[PDB]
């Protein structure tokens, strides 16, 4: 199931899940058969597993399958995992921010306009309620990335 989710053969994994396989199949690295699908951007396989209710659990590296999907720049699976109706807000802000970050620097996916627009959407969604403002906790500035201190405001973004 895990390799079939990683590979593009959606027929094989759909047949395996239709044959009453294990949806919560833990791996040695903690990837529960959703990260393999949500690493190669296979939207249909993720759709099939969500239909079979594969469930979302943090892997060994402290990452959700949504986190891996955001890391691999694959936006469509990020959307599908956000539409799972059990996600809360903080996961949505961090997932959109991670998607913008991954789009900022990658080999296959490099579109800086996507990074700016996704970070803008993350900031606007973050500053949506007006009151109860979800201010970003910021690590102290690191000399490697210049000396910037993120963008705590939409104006500086």
């Amino acid at each position: 199931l895990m390799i079939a989710a990683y590979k593009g053969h959606t027929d094989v994994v759909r047949y395996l899940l239709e044959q009453r396989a294990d949806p919560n199949a833990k791996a040695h690295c903690g990837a529960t058969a959703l990260h393999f699908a949500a690493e190669a951007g296979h939207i249909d396989i993720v759709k099939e597993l969500i239909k079979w209710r594969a469930a979302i659990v943090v892997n060994g590296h402290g990452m959700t399958p949504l986190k891996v999907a955001a890391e691999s720049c694959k936006a469509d699976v990020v959307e599908l995992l956000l539409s799972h109706a059990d996600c809360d807000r903080r996961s949505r802000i961090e997932a959109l921010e991670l998607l913008g970050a991954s789009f900022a620097n990658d080999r296959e996916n490099y579109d800086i306009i996507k990074t700016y627009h996704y970070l803008y959407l993350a900031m606007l969604e973050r500053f949506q309620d007006g009151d109860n403002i979800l201010e970003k906790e910021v690590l102290p500035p690191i000399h490697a990335y210049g000396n910037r201190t993120e963008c705590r405001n939409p104006q500086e973004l």
Binding site: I3, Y6, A27, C29, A31, H35, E39, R107, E108
Partner: peptide, 21 residues
Amino acid sequence: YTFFPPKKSHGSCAPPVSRAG
């Protein structure tokens, strides 16, 4: 050659992906 890092596959080879995994 250049400086382009061939590590984008290495970030994805940590999952058990092979003929056997």
